[PDB]
Amino acid sequence: GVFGNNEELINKILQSSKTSNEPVWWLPIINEYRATLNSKYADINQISSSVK
Amino acid sequence: SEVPQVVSLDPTSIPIEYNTPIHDIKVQVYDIKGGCNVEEGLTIFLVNNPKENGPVKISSKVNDKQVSEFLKDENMEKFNVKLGTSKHFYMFNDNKNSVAVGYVGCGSVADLSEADMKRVVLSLVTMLHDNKLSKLTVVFEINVDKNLFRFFLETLFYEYMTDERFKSEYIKHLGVYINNADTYKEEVEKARVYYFGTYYASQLIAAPSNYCNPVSLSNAAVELAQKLNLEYKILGVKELEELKMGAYLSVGKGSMYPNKFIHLTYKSKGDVKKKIALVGKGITFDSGGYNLKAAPGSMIDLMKFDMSGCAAVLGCAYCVGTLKPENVEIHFLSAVCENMVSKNSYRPGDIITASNGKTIEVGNTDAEGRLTLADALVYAEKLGVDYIVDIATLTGAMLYSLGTSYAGVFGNNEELINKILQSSKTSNEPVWWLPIINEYRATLNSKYADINQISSSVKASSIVASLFLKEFVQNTAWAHIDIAGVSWNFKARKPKGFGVRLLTEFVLN
Amino acid sequence: ASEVPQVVSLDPTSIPIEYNTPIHDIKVQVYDIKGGCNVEEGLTIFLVNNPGKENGPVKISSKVNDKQVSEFLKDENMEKFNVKLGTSKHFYMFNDNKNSVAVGYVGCGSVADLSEADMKRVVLSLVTMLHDNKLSKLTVVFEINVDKNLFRFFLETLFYEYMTDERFKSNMEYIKHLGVYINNADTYKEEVEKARVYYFGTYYASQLIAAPSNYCNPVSLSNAAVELAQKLNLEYKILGVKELEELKMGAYLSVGKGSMYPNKFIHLTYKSKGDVKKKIALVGKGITFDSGGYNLKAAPGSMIDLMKFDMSGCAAVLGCAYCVGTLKPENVEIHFLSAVCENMVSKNSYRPGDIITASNGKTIEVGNTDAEGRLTLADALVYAEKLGVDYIVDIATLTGAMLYSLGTSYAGVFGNNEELINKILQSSKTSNEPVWWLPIINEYRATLNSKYADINQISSSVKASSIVASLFLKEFVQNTAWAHIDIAGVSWNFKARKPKGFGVRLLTEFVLND
Amino acid sequence: SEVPQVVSLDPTSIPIEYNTPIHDIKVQVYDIKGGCNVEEGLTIFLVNNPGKENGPVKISSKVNDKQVSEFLKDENMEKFNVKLGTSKHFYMFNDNKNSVAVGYVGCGSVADLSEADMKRVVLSLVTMLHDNKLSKLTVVFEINVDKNLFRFFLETLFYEYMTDERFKSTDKNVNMEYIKHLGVYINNADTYKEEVEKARVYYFGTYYASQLIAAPSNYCNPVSLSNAAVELAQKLNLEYKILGVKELEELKMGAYLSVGKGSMYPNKFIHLTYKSKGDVKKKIALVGKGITFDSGGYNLKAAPGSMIDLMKFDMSGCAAVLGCAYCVGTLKPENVEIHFLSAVCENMVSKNSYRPGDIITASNGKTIEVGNTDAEGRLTLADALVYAEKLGVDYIVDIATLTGAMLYSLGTSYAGVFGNNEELINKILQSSKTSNEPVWWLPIINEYRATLNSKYADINQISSSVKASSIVASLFLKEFVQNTAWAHIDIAGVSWNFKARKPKGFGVRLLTEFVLN
Ligand SMILES: CC(C)C[C@H](CP(=O)(O)[C@@H](N)c1ccccc1)C(=O)O
Ligand SMILES: CC(C)C[C@H](CP(=O)(O)[C@@H](N)c1ccccc1)C(=O)O
Ligand SMILES: [Zn+2]
Ligand SMILES: [Zn+2]
Ligand SMILES: [Zn+2]
Ligand SMILES: [Zn+2]
Ligand SMILES: [Zn+2]
Ligand SMILES: [Zn+2]
């Protein structure tokens, strides 16, 4: 799976996937899940409370 | 279509409300130029600050001097725009009439996602449920296209509506202030139709399995068909036997309710230029069969939701039959049954024959959805359609790939897949494209039957299930939407009614 | 009665009940210990302690009327043995007249005040001697201090543990005489026939519980109640399915839907001869087998093979009807209620998620079909309150969690009325069936709020199951003093592999001393 | 005293806040019969309506302002009900032609609010303080409360308002502002006045406890926690000693020492002492469980629902006792002598750990057979109880996160209390009433004692047969108190607020009330 913050770069990876015949598939970074990384005490949680 | 009972107390029909208080709300859209009038009820400004957790600043002119004083920058800067954060105050306006004024923070990103807007609306609804109001006014101080604006209304209507059918005062006016209001007016009634399609689907999903069973669910579809002047046909066990739907029929053998196959048709007045079949998974309760749902986390108490796909298709039938698109013929299908434990149930290991003649080895009686859909797909292709799209709560594995927000779409045809992706964009029901990986196909080779129902090895369940279904469509553009993850809103303890607007947008454009 | 449905013709159609036990043929005499002991017949056993000196030597104080036994009992010989609780020795010998007798002791520890748990150990040690005995008389000599209630407890426990249930089978001989020597004999004598009644009520409850679910089902159990009522001259009524439907007991009927046996609601009545000054309803959980339903008992530790015990509540209420109908208290009207059914897996069973409607009009969202007991109790409670009683007491194997809170010795009691709870606790003391008051914590009530129905059957979150179940039942009692006794932990004796018949004496003492 | 580290980025102390924003709040109490002034930011009426459920709001107070009075007339207010936890905000100009904020919080229909009800009320109030930059709050009491409930209102207002940001860095709340002034209007006010600063003391004890509990195990370890107690003792002028490994060995605390064998931090035994001037009428030992992290040991917490990520909280009892010491050391009660004790260590997995099966010796000569290394608390309490009784005290009270079994008996609201003496138990229950920290009495069932008989050692650590752990645990502890009144408060269920994701600081107020009255 490939995730990213930049469509151009994701596409370079996908194209590199084509020519190297190492199969990769673009998966989304779903921002709705970001709040489950909110920590009561630290800046951020390492893992999610609720999202599997 | 008589609903069998064990005791005389057993329900014989799904209760349905068609006339909801939302349908009595009078909606006006006003242009924001000219300024906002604040005369009654509750006025909410939707506000962002592109900064992070920045202060609230109201831009719009308000044609009331008391309320303008309340909305001046010195006072609003005590509040912030953190997404979903809200405040509202009661006060006297110029006329010494009591009104309430406040805001909903929309954060610090200019273009809200569907998830953000959901959060904004949820905050707005909290205020509506807590205040006896005759009228709500919403002032848009954020940017929003026609589709997101429509989405805001659908969502507001749906979240505002409270389902009370199993229990033993709403606003009468909605005002909207938005820049260039004339362009948005046409979305209002479209929203009302989409709202009810979603709420209707929700009503079937939320209705428990003693209420919503194969007979009462199919009775419900017939009632709907009649109200919309759609052709309808319910196939019963005798018909299904002549049609040799062994995969479908085997799932339902353990039930006290006969299998009921739903087939609604919409045909446009003019020439038909496109034929479509929408196929929904219709398991009214999934106990898992002899592979009982007994493991920790198997969520047996929510398995009334396993008919969500069928619900989605019927909600679409409502929208389509109301908005009357042209040059299309739509078949609405669902192979409805119940997956139970009984002396009559199908067993792990059983070899059954689908209606296209393929023998299947059952490896797990809790992978029932793909067997009923196998026969529904074969049926749909025989209709001679251009597109087959199924929607289904098919694999719990979805929770581990996309989670609870995005449905997955699989398909055998890139054009169809992109049509669904576009429909996902305009309906704001998020879907993501996932691969049908042919290297896994061999794990479905049965030693004895033509094909295995499940893989023993490969844990990529959503993909294997797609690979299974792909065998039952030979020559038609077909896509499959797996909504196992997104159908039920766990936080809110209710259905989303996912899929209706998605499918409808697909049919309409 | 009703016909018991069968699958095959080898299926039993009634519960075998022994009414006339060997226990009833024992003649019981109580003598004052101040006068010395007559040890010329059978097995004589001294109950001895040694205060202060932990595990101290045995020492017999009593004068006996036989020279051979006297020499055996002298200190030089008895100090070979010690008093560690439950430890025993007994010896065969010839008395002065060359007849065969046997003499021993049971240690009662080094603490002067025996608890009921300690007493049970002593009795068990005694029962072990009896289970290998063929002499016709047993004499027990109390060289320890007990009060009236504990003495009655000793007799009841001796009788219950002595009796062995052989109804399902295809060495020793029961004694014909029991002799007791104890201080103040005359004041203890009136406890003997009360103990005999309390014993059989308990034993009768035990026989129903122990009876497996193929023998004991809703039809055979309700039949047994009818037969009991007839032997005791009690008013009875059995409500079948059509009557239950008319009364709208939708929660109760949902639980039974998957069974091959028709639901049977049991209602027996004792009415006193004179003026009636208190009306009580006793309500018993009556699940003749709890498979769990679709939420099947499949997890490790879930104890599915023992789930014939799940009508223990019912058994205890019926055992109480035996005691009450025999002892005939005055000024009281008592109703004995159990909504009996079977919780099974079937095409016809109720499902997780189903919304059902109780007879008081409340709708209930079923979270877990294995939380079946509170559903059947909910309708039974609505039935009881409609009788206009002063007190409703229910008793039930309701929550496994009791095993984690009070364990296998004490039951929990919950209630909406402080006075009724104190009466239960006082009944606990005099019956020596230990109970402990637990709270009904209102803060948890919100967890029962359903999104669609009027109320949830279970909490999703809150793990305090016994409190949550109590909160739920509470919703079906509008304005009557009500208590709930959860015996899921104490009902089955895991070590001895048998029931305790827990509750018969508790409830009987409750109705007798109000 | 020196905290060992693995790498230089390892913390060497617990960050502790003493001067909190709550402490800078000027609090004034006024008598309601003088009438409310409404001049500045946010005035909240606490209002109920007995009998009429969800009944209308009516403001009974005399408000000394025409404009505001006109706003609060019944006619204006009838569209609002008093449903518990409900609030509204009002906005208007007063007589000085100044803008002003006004509102109410519904206190239901029952004239007597429970502590759970009052908590729901404070929570509602607090939401009106968050996300609103106010400099003053005034609360007008139009419900009836006794002096203990009023104090509880303030303690809870203070505690819930305070936001713990010691471990925030790039994510402090940019908009957090605390009021500087709190006004309270109430009937018969000068009776209530002395509750205010007591509330402030009770607030910090709880917050201090809470601060140690929330602090993660890399910050809060036996060295740093015992360092913190010293620091607290110095600030309060309490006598203190910290017993280290070599003195513990001399005291033969083999049970306590075994639990900590596997840790990189040396065991540290905290012993603080408050002594009244004059005649000492009561001597009391308070004993807190101080496992700074409970991994379970070789019986690792690896099962589903084991909550290993929360086990920084296993020092909650010790924190309760240090918080009590703050309150006692601040309020200076007469005629008592208090010892505050905690046998502090970490239960870890190492080549140096104690194993299941080990037989260890307690400081009173009893040999113990360890059946499960994750029942570590009762071992450390065994030695702490033996030490406590050696002080020759009248009452030993211990407080511990001892058994998860509490989640299945009383759940998350009530602590359990066990003991060998009825009078001491009842004093605890009494303190529970006036501290408003709920406790329920639970039995020590002697019949289970036999399941702790060991074949090889004097006694078993755990039961073979009995799933009632809280009771078995208490039976074990009883074995180490020979002739002293002793009670045991099991707070495993209530210590952590799962909904709010933070400590409750449970027990500080309880223990302080116990010591005070
Ligand atoms: C075949 C197994 C892997 C079982 C299921 C498929 P299902 O048909 O029971 C479906 N109803 C489901 C939806 C969401 C959550 C759980 C189950 C699975 O785990 O995907
Ligand atoms: C699995 C849970 C729902 C268990 C209990 C209810 P139960 O009715 O099955 C009862 N029969 C029971 C007794 C003793 C041991 C175990 C089970 C519960 O706490 O709700
Ligand atoms: Zn399934
Ligand atoms: Zn399914
Ligand atoms: Zn059950
Ligand atoms: Zn049960
Ligand atoms: Zn532990
Ligand atoms: Zn611990």
Author numbering:
A (entry chain B): 501 to 552
B (entry chain E): 86 to 135, 137 to 254, 262 to 602
C (entry chain D): 85 to 254, 260 to 603
D (entry chain C): 86 to 602
What did the publication describing this PDB structure actually write?
PfA-M1 coordinates a single zinc metal ion, while PfA-M17 contains two metal binding sites. The two aminopeptidases are each encoded by non-homologous genes and have been validated in vitro and in vivo as drug targets, as inhibition of their activity can control both murine and laboratory malaria parasites. The X-ray crystal structures of the potent compound 12 in complex with both PfA-M1 and PfA-M17 were solved to a resolution of 2.0 and 2.3 Å respectively.
As in the case of hPheP[CH2]Phe, both zinc ions of PfA-M17 are tightly coordinated to one or both of the phosphinate oxygens of compound 12, and the latter can also form a hydrogen bond to the catalytic carbonate. With such chirality, compound 12 is still able to orient its amino moiety towards Asp399 (interacting with the latter via a hydrogen bond) and at the same time to direct the phenyl substituent towards the hydrophobic pocket formed by Met392, Met396, Phe398, Gly489, Leu492 and Ala577. Disordered electron density for the carboxylate and leucyl substituents of compound 12 is observed in all twelve chains of the PfA-M17 binding pockets, indicating substantial flexibility of binding. As a result, the complete compound could be build in only one of the active sites (Chain E), and even then could only be modeled with half occupancy for the flexible carboxylate and leucyl groups. Unlike the experimentally determined structure, the docked pose shows that only a single zinc is coordinated by the phosphinic moiety. The amine moiety is also oriented differently: rather than forming a hydrogen bond with Asp399, it is directed in the opposite direction and forms hydrogen bonds to the main chain oxygen atoms of Thr486 and Leu487. The chirality difference between the docked compound and the experimentally determined binding pose is, therefore, probably responsible for the observed discrepancy.
